[PDB]
Amino acid sequence: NNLHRELAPISEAAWKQIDDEARDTFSLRAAGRRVVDVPEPAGPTLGSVSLGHLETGSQTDGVQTSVYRVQPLVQVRVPFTVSRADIDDVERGAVDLTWDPVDDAVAKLVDTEDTAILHGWEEAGITGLSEASVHQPVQMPAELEQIDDAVSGACNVLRLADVEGPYDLVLPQQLYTQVSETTDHGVPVVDHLTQLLSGGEVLWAPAARCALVVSRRGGDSCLFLGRDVSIGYLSHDAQTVTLYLEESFTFRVHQPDAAVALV
Template sequence: MTSILRRSLAPITEKAWAEVDDQATQILKTQLSARRFVDVDGPHGWGLAAVDTGRLQLTDPETTRDVPWGLRAVLPLLEVRLPFVVKQMELDAISRGCKDPDLESLQQAVRQASWFEESAVYYGLPDASIQGLLQVPEREKVSLPEDPLQYPRAVAQAMEILQSNALPGPYCAIFGRKPFFKLMQQPDCSDPPRRLIEEMTGASMRCSPALTDGVVVSAARGHFELTVGQDWSIGYASHDRDDVELYITESFTFRVLEPAAVVELGVDR
């Protein structure tokens, strides 16, 4: 039976599909920073449409016709479908043993798709009823200094806030590309700032393509939940003599269960 991805209908050999999947997986592993500290619930498959919040939205008593009732509050999953085109000749070349196929369109689509998930987690997506980490109204903020040598001090201040809220470690520091690579470019010294941060938090420092500055979070379970229906997959759309249209897809939603478990690291602008 053909699945919703319709991969069996594509003019693509098993070897070429394996290369497409492998390249997509490698990029996703480097880009999806939030999955390192959130609880990932799933994947549950295409059949999952919403997450039960356990809450009830009560109706106006004047409209209940003497029988009170309410609607169960659910958080619907959004579905991503981002198309891209690959040359048929490049896919065929993989089956002939080509080790450097031109799959740039695939790579760009996967990077764009992973940025979308990261952006939803950190900055939210109101149209999908997703509140991001940096949309939490009561979140606290620590100033991120210009000098990357001072980043460990900012992270320590954020950890102090989390500990004062009785939120256990390990903690995780995530930075946007600019501050992350400023840290990476620091010359070797007895106590490089990256090592100090990782020793303090108890976890590897992460870089997110969607973040501008940074955040420090409690990585203990139960604070943040990413619910996945269909995890990132490559599907087939159509083809002609020269081109094959594929797409990358996922269904997911995200919610913050413990607002106090995130501290923003922000540059004063």
């Protein structure tokens, strides 16, 4: 493979613990991955995803020159380092062992993935839900005792646009803490918002830094990925091993009417 893990000085048992540490944390942290449908990964050789056609400028001499449009995939590699003594301890069955570097790498990777999915990157050509939306942003009240007003406004905007199915709400953890100081510790406000969302859930996204409402009916956007996050190898030292988390992905919004930003 291109992730030469056989050439790494890490034992098989420690490989299992590294991979498991990488999986659980990624599933927990991933928020935008749960609001955008993701087709099964193509594999390394995907390269790009084919969009529609496009007439060139000059179709002269009675010929046609429809040029194809393609969106190339981006690859995100996050290197991290693990000590050789820590990896060695897993064979003597050390119990107090921890994998903080893997968690840090997962946090970095998921942060950049979610920022691109929810908002956009504009450097790889990816445009997120919060930027492709055609609806005007729903201004949120400053008090936070009336966020239900903004949620209802977004729900009304989607309803009068033929958006169907449960509306999901994505917020930041900062707004989470700000809501835990409202009335009965934000239990009543959150309950009211859960009713307004037409059966949808409220998702707290640590990686997100913007609020938006997205329909969960599916088919409005897709996440095309060639390689799920994977642990590779770069080099090793006398007392250190260097790995990386590798993932190739790209986000395409087909129907920009299903998402409205709250800001």
